[PDB]
Every structure is written in structure tokens, then in C-alpha cells.
Amino acid sequence: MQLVLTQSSSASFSLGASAKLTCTLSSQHSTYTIEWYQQQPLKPPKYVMELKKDGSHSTGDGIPDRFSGSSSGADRYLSISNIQPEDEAIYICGVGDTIKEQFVYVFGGGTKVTV
Amino acid sequence: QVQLQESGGGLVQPGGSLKLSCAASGFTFRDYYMYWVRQTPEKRLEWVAFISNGGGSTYYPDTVKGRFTISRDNAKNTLYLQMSRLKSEDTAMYYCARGRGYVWFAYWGQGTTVTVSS
Amino acid sequence: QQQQQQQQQQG
């Protein structure tokens, strides 16, 4: 099957609240490590974190500790504890597969987070 | 501090061509893999090219393989993207990116827009 | 299922 990423629906949040964003890998690739990206209006996307199958993760630079991740089978979650106006952005997940015969990299369709 | 700045975008027509540039700094350019990623008007992100640190290898998704050509000049700390036989679908904001660890797109530039008319 | 392929970005 094709390597695809399906992202949870767009939703609004209230300051201080907690958010959980979902990105689902195609079943045949449920063990894959993915990446979360955050893009604010008219800004380049920004690397947030790398999330593995066991849920372990490492965030990029400039990412508040109120950002964490976890997994559940094929699902990869981006958790945002507390929340601030600056978290308002489009969150996109991506997944790479450096297969020698041919490289692949897919992005999900993004999840717009309002606050 | 790692910085990447693209340029070269502008208005073009289907079947035409143009070449984009990315001036890199804040790191040793010849040691990292480089990439081009684009964002359509619909805001969908899409990987379009990969080139190894010394220019030895390149990869492209099927949508541009055969039309686009990624290259680099390590002495000039510059990455390039030759876009040929342009298509309406090539209209997008083009980003230059560098990786870190196993993450492909650790650093992004500001982008340059390529608009294919007609 | 399929095993994911990765590479170190610096060399």
C-alpha cells in the first residue's frame, strides 16, 4: 500500500487548555518515525519534533517543553499542554523513507489549530 | 545560527523554465544533505528534491522527476533548483531545507514563490 | 510490515 498520513480534524482551543493532534500512518507503515511541523501565518514551516513508534521523541530548538508526543499503534500524537496564542498555527506531520531504489517523503494535509 | 535564503521566483508560463537559488550560512554547507520542499496555494507541503552533501546523489518524487534538477556549488555555499517544462501545478512557495540527525527538514529558508500562469 | 529507512543528515 501507499505511504500516507491522515491528520485529525481542525479544531479550536481555549487558553491554558490541553490539545491533542493526531496523525495516522498507513497500516503497512505503523512502525515508522514521523515529524511534526508547525507553520504560523506567512512564516516558513518549523520543525517541532521527531516521534517514534514507542512514542519517544526529541523536539527541535525553540520548542516549549509544553510540547510532547506519544504513539498508539499507527497513530502519532502531538500534545500541547497549557496553550498560548502563539500556538495558533497549522500543524503538519511528515514521514521519510530513504529507500535506496527511490526516496519517499509524504506530508499529511495539516491540522489548523485556532485559539 | 543556520540560515537559508531563497531567490529566483517570479511569474512564468507553462512550458517555461527558471532556476532557483538558496544562499546558505551559519554552518558547513559541504557536510549536509540539502532539499527543496514546496507549498501549493492550497497550503499542502510537498517534498521535491534531495541532493547529498557532495552532490553525489539526487532523488525526486515522480511529480517532478525528469523536469526539475537539484544541484549545488559547495564553494559558493549555494543550492539550486533548475525547473524545466513548467506546469500549472508547479505554482507554489519553494523552500530550501537542511537536515539534522535523521530529520530531513530541520531548517527551512524563507521561501520564494514561483507562479505559473496561463 | 515495512521497515523504515533513515540516514544521518551530516557526514
PDB file of N, CA, C and O in Angstrom, chain A residues 27-28 30 33 96-98, chain C residues 1-7:
ATOM      1  N   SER A  27      -1.419   1.635   7.750  1.00  0.00           N
ATOM      2  CA  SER A  27      -1.146   0.400   8.485  1.00  0.00           C
ATOM      3  C   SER A  27       0.174  -0.288   8.153  1.00  0.00           C
ATOM      4  O   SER A  27       0.916  -0.681   9.051  1.00  0.00           O
ATOM      5  N   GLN A  28       0.473  -0.431   6.868  1.00  0.00           N
ATOM      6  CA  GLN A  28       1.712  -1.077   6.441  1.00  0.00           C
ATOM      7  C   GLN A  28       2.962  -0.357   6.937  1.00  0.00           C
ATOM      8  O   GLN A  28       4.064  -0.885   6.842  1.00  0.00           O
ATOM      9  N   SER A  30       2.959   1.425  10.154  1.00  0.00           N
ATOM     10  CA  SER A  30       2.702   1.819  11.537  1.00  0.00           C
ATOM     11  C   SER A  30       3.898   1.849  12.486  1.00  0.00           C
ATOM     12  O   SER A  30       3.767   2.314  13.608  1.00  0.00           O
ATOM     13  N   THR A  33       8.862   6.348  12.066  1.00  0.00           N
ATOM     14  CA  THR A  33       9.128   7.529  12.873  1.00  0.00           C
ATOM     15  C   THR A  33       8.641   8.685  11.986  1.00  0.00           C
ATOM     16  O   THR A  33       8.886   8.678  10.783  1.00  0.00           O
ATOM     17  N   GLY A  96       9.552  10.224   6.309  1.00  0.00           N
ATOM     18  CA  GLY A  96      10.500   9.913   5.258  1.00  0.00           C
ATOM     19  C   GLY A  96      10.854   8.441   5.192  1.00  0.00           C
ATOM     20  O   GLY A  96      10.768   7.723   6.184  1.00  0.00           O
ATOM     21  N   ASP A  97      11.254   7.990   4.008  1.00  0.00           N
ATOM     22  CA  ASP A  97      11.629   6.602   3.799  1.00  0.00           C
ATOM     23  C   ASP A  97      12.742   6.598   2.759  1.00  0.00           C
ATOM     24  O   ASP A  97      12.476   6.580   1.557  1.00  0.00           O
ATOM     25  N   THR A  98      13.985   6.626   3.226  1.00  0.00           N
ATOM     26  CA  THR A  98      15.137   6.645   2.335  1.00  0.00           C
ATOM     27  C   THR A  98      15.432   5.291   1.706  1.00  0.00           C
ATOM     28  O   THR A  98      16.469   4.688   1.965  1.00  0.00           O
TER      29      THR A  98
ATOM     30  N   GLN C   1       5.455  -5.659   9.071  1.00  0.00           N
ATOM     31  CA  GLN C   1       5.241  -4.737   7.923  1.00  0.00           C
ATOM     32  C   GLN C   1       6.584  -4.213   7.430  1.00  0.00           C
ATOM     33  O   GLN C   1       7.625  -4.809   7.697  1.00  0.00           O
ATOM     34  N   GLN C   2       6.553  -3.083   6.730  1.00  0.00           N
ATOM     35  CA  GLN C   2       7.757  -2.477   6.166  1.00  0.00           C
ATOM     36  C   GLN C   2       8.640  -1.781   7.199  1.00  0.00           C
ATOM     37  O   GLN C   2       8.140  -1.101   8.091  1.00  0.00           O
ATOM     38  N   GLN C   3       9.952  -1.962   7.080  1.00  0.00           N
ATOM     39  CA  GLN C   3      10.894  -1.314   7.987  1.00  0.00           C
ATOM     40  C   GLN C   3      11.296   0.012   7.360  1.00  0.00           C
ATOM     41  O   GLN C   3      11.696   0.061   6.201  1.00  0.00           O
ATOM     42  N   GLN C   4      11.203   1.080   8.138  1.00  0.00           N
ATOM     43  CA  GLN C   4      11.539   2.416   7.670  1.00  0.00           C
ATOM     44  C   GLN C   4      13.037   2.614   7.457  1.00  0.00           C
ATOM     45  O   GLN C   4      13.856   2.128   8.240  1.00  0.00           O
ATOM     46  N   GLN C   5      13.389   3.324   6.390  1.00  0.00           N
ATOM     47  CA  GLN C   5      14.787   3.607   6.087  1.00  0.00           C
ATOM     48  C   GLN C   5      15.118   5.048   6.481  1.00  0.00           C
ATOM     49  O   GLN C   5      14.330   5.960   6.244  1.00  0.00           O
ATOM     50  N   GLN C   6      16.281   5.248   7.091  1.00  0.00           N
ATOM     51  CA  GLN C   6      16.713   6.579   7.500  1.00  0.00           C
ATOM     52  C   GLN C   6      18.195   6.779   7.194  1.00  0.00           C
ATOM     53  O   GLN C   6      18.907   5.828   6.878  1.00  0.00           O
ATOM     54  N   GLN C   7      18.652   8.023   7.306  1.00  0.00           N
ATOM     55  CA  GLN C   7      20.050   8.374   7.071  1.00  0.00           C
ATOM     56  C   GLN C   7      20.483   9.498   8.006  1.00  0.00           C
ATOM     57  O   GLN C   7      19.660  10.301   8.439  1.00  0.00           O
TER      58      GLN C   7
END
